[PDB]
Design a protein around this ligand. Structure first.
Ligand SMILES: *C/C=C1/C(=C/c2[nH]c(/C=C3[NH+]=C(/C=C4\NC(=O)C(C=C)=C4C)C(C)=C\3CCC(=O)O)c(CCC(=O)O)c2C)NC(=O)[C@H]1C
Ligand SMILES: *C/C=C1/C(=C/c2[nH]c(/C=C3[NH+]=C(/C=C4\NC(=O)C(C=C)=C4C)C(C)=C\3CCC(=O)O)c(CCC(=O)O)c2C)NC(=O)[C@H]1C
Ligand SMILES: [Cl-]
Ligand SMILES: [Cl-]
Lengths: 673, 672
């Protein structure tokens, strides 16, 4: 942690106010209201001697006038400018001026310039934009960017350096001409670019160090300013470089550098870092070119990214359509999970899936055991996180004591499904990412004008470390896809159980209907359904002039059967006779049990002679029916016909008298009266 | 069809091979293999005389060598270049050359050039990128684009002109100065820019007409070429303009124009159109500046577009989540539609919603009546589409006879949910008034290519109206609406599951009631008596316990049923069970054994106490209240546990005794 303190001290050095400049130009600082020159870079006289003859040494600038040192166009522009830190570029024959207003000051930088004329720059823009426009993948864009930046700048090494969410970074593309060792995929620490340093790219996108060993030129006071606090030099390019970073570059083996921040809207997403093994200046026009190219390649990379999102979203919809088309074929949600979880593992970039529904747990791929999965589920409920999803890429740290000791899982995405509980679980094995860093960790202290700080490390040689217990983090697009899949499963599960419950409710109500309208011993209609049916048959026949008749029969000398044989045997006979009678009947007829041992048949659409015929078929059916162990059995049948009757008892009385006459005339008979 | 053929004829005029150029430059056509100049523009003499002292007339070029007219860099570059139609730009002190190889020719255009040294272009490029980068919406971007193109080009009218999928177009942004009338939101017909003209932008993104009245300079032959077919001049900037489009611009009040194609990947999405009231040249560098700026504004606009998909998806997910909050609030889906449909109308930019689930219909906002909605539903099933959704922005054309006559509805998005279940999203037809830059004109014009539509004479505003159409249903809305619909399905499914659970609980509980008790009487049904009796016998057989059974029956009960009715007989059964149950001791079990005969199991009761119990029961039914109903009598048999094996034997004994009581005078107690 002493190194944590050392790194934190890096932020102490006020790099925006070094009171010195790099020597590839000069600088004046003027008061706006006073109109006086208050500061001048120590090499000012070798530049402004072009504007004014008398200026041979620095001390001279005290008696010079600004309106003698600057082109009138730059004075007019500065007098006119209201916005601050918006630099104005005005050039002459031999000097190129860059000036801006900052609070009450006019800061003016001057470089040596000579007019070259060509169409080179416009051709480079056309070629760069054509190539960037043709990039359709992440890797293509960044590599074309590295090629263009290298061809334009001539720097011996160019590399795209992407930041992590913790500010550590990695070289993701690289173009090297000379004998540099390749730094592709090497990781660099946050302390390499302090927050103040990263914040500069937001004020000026390009930083230029044309010579790491160029002695910086301090600013000298010339007329006493009203404020005296060091003037902010951040908007320009001449601002002196921290000696810590110069020694860093020396240790890195770099003589000149140029870096351009890569912005995603207002966020610093990375930098284009360019190195040279010898000093190397870049003119204003090449600076503007590199910056415009990187700004263009940037928005192209954001457009490629946002498009890959839309296209993922399409892929998710295609997967959900795949789910519903297979869903309509009577499968359970567990069956659907088994078929598509391999696709889902690709869709969600996870190593395993587990689905919970009731007592059943379905797993595909790498998963914890059932018991640990329930410890997970329980902890999700007991933690009380009502979040639509719960997710972590370092389970061991975000939820300690949750997993077994040696378990390899680090990522969990859990979607709750309402009730009892249900869940969708997405698992990611920890990826034991071996990281290659550019240099050992070096805890070295360095004494500085601000205090004691971390010094730049001396070795940049490859050093590997390993990260365990972590997975890839769960991207937002995957959270929403997983949520959508989970609910598409809930709809399959809901439809399944709705159908099953409808089956159970129909079966239960059907048993309620069976016990209400049938006879326990025989299974034929009980008397209440016969009585009701007969009453409506009478009403119908009287209203609409239909024809029907009834058969009322009884078992003969049946009590002798019960007493000689038994009640178990007697009931087997009643069941037998009902089975034999039902085979004779037509589907229109209704057959039920009227009393003990007495049965009723309602024969609709039947005239009297055909009725007698049916009574004969019934009487003969019970006669010949196979007795097997039990005794032979006989029925005596009475018959009645609809003769404009008022009430159904009148029919039952007629049929009963006929049936009783059948009993007196020899029991095995059909009788009507 | 009358004017339609004329509009289609415009694609006959071969604008790629006019064999002439605009006079703001000069042109050469050289054979690659021959190395000779085979064609040169009619004003080639006043341009190359800058390069060569000797050239005074056009004919002088015949005796010229290309190594005397062209810069060495341009010849080396053309000899070296493999790809065709990729122009090379080489400038000198007084001439600016642009040349490329095409088939077996090298085409070289030359314009007068003055070295202007300044930092202007770099400053404008920086301002353009800073301002475009600060554009965060579609409207800001396109308007900033028009401001930049006007500052850079100096043209008096700049318009962003976007194409329809049918190639008609509309001005969607504009910066217009003093002499011009405003042209914002005016619609132009497809015939204004034929397919060949749109195709040109894919060959060269910028087109320049610096002077509408500048006489075109033909190409003259100079050396006899090997082929003689007209040479294609598409990749350059000097290609002469169709005379129809010149007269077009004249009618438009335009002296000079410039357009830059706006490309989305490879498809032409619109054009940046610029007009001037005077002649107006643009240097090669302002051309490159305008094209680079438009290419940057292009990708920026596509990024804003792709970002607003993402942001939509976020807003939809948030709406579905808001619906899920109500998911754990025990509300119906019809209540949910009522709470949120005003929000959904914004989410889906529709005027009304109707949700059907079962017999129930919920509507919010503008909807047809229930009757029309059902005619719609019916047509949707009889359509039978396997489609996840069904959608139209013009109902009368896509599904005729379906709405009433005077109906205002034109848009429908229908999500099937499954009886029928549907989510319907309704859009009133927007009676969009379109203002066009000129009436339709059926005007013919005779030309060397044939007769085709001539450019219209008036550009004054003319309005027309489109009825029966709404905004079209974007793909993002189809999927969002489907997801809302399914979020409603989960709410309906849960409700239906709760009600089914309640109904199955009530029905299974009534099955339990009927599993052991008798529906009519409330006494134990016969199965429960059979079971109790079997276990009572086994127990008595293990431990030599004493118990008895009483088997009684109603006397002449068939006569009561037939004399009175089904209702009276059952009331008698309930009375007798009520009277008997009050007689019993708490240990005895009483159940209904047959239709008219009942059973009592009296444990811990010997034969005298059993007989006493049978007598109490017989007296209990006799004293019982006849009320409206007839007087009723029971005859009871009695059996005792006498070292029995099975309950079968016992009920047989009791039955014989009971029938013995019936014959000996019905109101009696008997044992046997
Ligand atoms: C305790 C302070 C530390 C420190 C300070 C520091 N570093 C900078 C500037 C830069 N550092 C950069 C680092 C890299 N250059 C590369 O080529 C790569 C790898 C691809 C990395 C990580 C870069 C790029 C800059 C910007 C300037 C440049 O382009 O070289 C500053 C700010 C200096 C300034 O710009 O005035 C400071 C204060 N660096 C440490 O390592 C510790 C010691
Ligand atoms: C039957 C053939 C027709 C025809 C031919 C034609 N038109 C062009 C060129 C252009 N027309 C344009 C139209 C517009 N400019 C605007 O400012 C607006 C309104 C916003 C419109 C609709 C444009 C832009 C061009 C491109 C040239 C330019 O930039 O001005 C061509 C091609 C010309 C050429 O380049 O050779 C042709 C063949 N136009 C008709 O109206 C009928 C007659
Ligand atoms: Cl600069
Ligand atoms: Cl050009």
């Amino acid at each position: 942690d002493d190194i944590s303190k050392l790194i934190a001290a890096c932020d102490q050095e006020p790099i925006h106010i070094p009171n010195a400049i790099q020597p590839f130009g000069a600088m004046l600082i003027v008061e706006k209201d006073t109109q006086q020159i208050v500061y001048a870079s120590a090499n000012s006289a070798e530049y402004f001697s072009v504007a004014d003859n008398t200026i041979h040494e620095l001390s001279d600038i005290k008696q010079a006038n600004i309106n003698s040192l600057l082109p009138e166009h730059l004075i007019s522009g500065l007098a006119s400018a209201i916005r601050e830190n918006e630099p104005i570029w005005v050039e002459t024959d031999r000097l190129s001026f860059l000036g801006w207003r900052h609070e009450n000051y006019y800061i003016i930088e001057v470089e040596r310039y000579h007019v070259q004329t060509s169409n080179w720059f416009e051709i480079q823009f056309q070629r760069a934009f054509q190539k960037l426009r043709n990039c359709k993948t992440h890797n293509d864009l960044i590599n074309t960017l590295t090629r263009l930046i290298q061809e334009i700048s001539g720097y011996d090494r160019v590399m795209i350096y992407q930041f992590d969410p913790e500010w550590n970074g990695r070289v993701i593309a690289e173009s090297v001409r000379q004998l540099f060792t390749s730094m592709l995929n090497h990781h660099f620490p946050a302390s390499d670019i302090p927050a103040q340093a990263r914040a500069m790219y937001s004020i000026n996108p390009i930083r230029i160090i044309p010579d790491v060993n160029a002695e910086p030129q301090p600013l000298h006071m010339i007329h006493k300013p009203q404020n005296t606090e060091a003037v902010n030099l951040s908007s320009g390019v001449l601002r002196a470089v921290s000696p810590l970073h110069m020694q860093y570059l020396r240790n890195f083996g770099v003589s000149a550098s140029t870096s351009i921040g890569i912005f995603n809207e207002d966020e610093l997403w990375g930098i284009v870092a360019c190195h040279h093994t010898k000093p190397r200046a870049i003119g204003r026009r090449i600076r503007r070119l590199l910056v415009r190219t990187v700004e263009f390649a940037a928005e192209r990379l954001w457009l490629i990214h946002s498009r890959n999102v839309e296209r993922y979203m399409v892929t998710v919809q295609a997967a959900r359509e795949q789910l519903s088309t297979t869903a309509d074929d009577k499968h359970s949600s567990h069956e659907i999970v088994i078929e598509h979880a391999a696709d889902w593992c690709k869709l969600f970039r996870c190593d395993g899936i587990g689905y919970l529904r009731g007592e059943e747990l379905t797993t595909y791929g790498e998963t914890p055991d059932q018991t640990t999965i329930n410890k997970l589920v329980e902890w999700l409920e007991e933690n009380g996180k009502k979040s639509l999803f719960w997710h972590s890429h370092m389970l061991k740290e975000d939820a300690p004591g949750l997993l077994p000791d040696g378990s390899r899982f680090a990522g969990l995405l859990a979607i709750p499904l309402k009730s009892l509980f249900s869940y969708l679980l997405l698992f990611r094995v920890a990826q034991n990412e071996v990281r290659t860093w550019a240099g050992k960790p070096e805890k070295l202290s360095v004494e500085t004008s601000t205090g004691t700080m971390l010094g730049p490390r001396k070795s940049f040689e490859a050093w590997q470390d390993e990260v365990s217990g972590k997975s890839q983090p769960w991207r937002t697009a995957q959270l929403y896809a997983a949520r959508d899949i989970a609910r598409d499963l809930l709809i399959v599960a809901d439809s399944m159980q709705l159908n099953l419950l409808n089956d159970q409710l129909a079966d239960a109500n059907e048993n309620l209907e069976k016990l209400a309208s049938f006879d326990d011993l025989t299974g034929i209609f009980n008397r209440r359904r016969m009585e009701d049916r007969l009453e409506s048959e009478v009403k119908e026949a009287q209203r609409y002039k239909k024809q029907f008749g009834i058969l009322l029969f009884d078992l003969d000398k049946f009590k002798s059967v019960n007493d000689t044989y038994g009640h178990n045997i007697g009931d087997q006979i009643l069941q037998n006779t009902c089975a034999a009678v039902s085979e004779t009947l037509r589907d229109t007829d209704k057959f039920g049990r009227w009393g003990g041992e007495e049965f009723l048949i309602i024969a609709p659409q039947t005239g009297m002679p055909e009725l007698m015929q049916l009574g004969e078929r019934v009487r003969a059916a019970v006669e010949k029916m196979q007795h097997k162990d039990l005794p032979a059995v006989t029925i005596s049948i009475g018959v009645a016909e609809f003769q404009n009757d008022t009430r159904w008892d009148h029919m039952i009385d007629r049929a009963d008298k006929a049936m009783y006459r059948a009993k007196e005339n020899g029991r095995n008979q059909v009788c009507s009266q």
